[PDB]
């Protein structure tokens, strides 16, 4: 990334021998708009994981059955989407 920016800047010096900057500043703000949100989500997730770590000792051995049935449900849905997409690819192959 740095080397590409450097080749670009060398070219800009070659040709040289304010709209773009404000555009760059706008995009800079834009990117981090979502990154502050990612921070918010990571922070909620970390506080929640610490909440779980509080229960972490011996707790209830039923949430395991709960998450395992959730695993059956999520794997079923993922296999649905997988077979669907693969059948669409076979459809394009036939066409």
């Amino acid at each position: 990334e740095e080397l590409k920016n450097a080749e670009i800047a060398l070219r800009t010096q070659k040709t040289p021998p304010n709209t773009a900057p404000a555009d760059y500043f706008h995009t800079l703000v834009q990117q981090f708009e979502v990154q502050l949100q990612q921070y918010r989500q990571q922070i909620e997730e970390l506080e929640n994981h610490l909440a779980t770590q509080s229960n972490t000792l011996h707790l209830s051995p039923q949430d395991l059955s709960m998450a395992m049935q959730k695993l059956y449900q999520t794997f079923v849905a993922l296999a649905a989407q997988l077979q669907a997409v693969n059948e669409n690819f076979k459809m394009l192959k036939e066409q």
């Binding site: 989500q41 909620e44 997730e45 970390l46 929640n48 909440a51 779980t52 949430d63 959730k70």
Partner: peptide
């Protein structure tokens, strides 16, 4: 993302 996925799910739980 599985720690963050358990985070989203358990955060939905707790």
């Amino acid at each position: 993302l599985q720690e963050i996925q358990q985070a989203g799910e358990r955060l939905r739980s707790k």
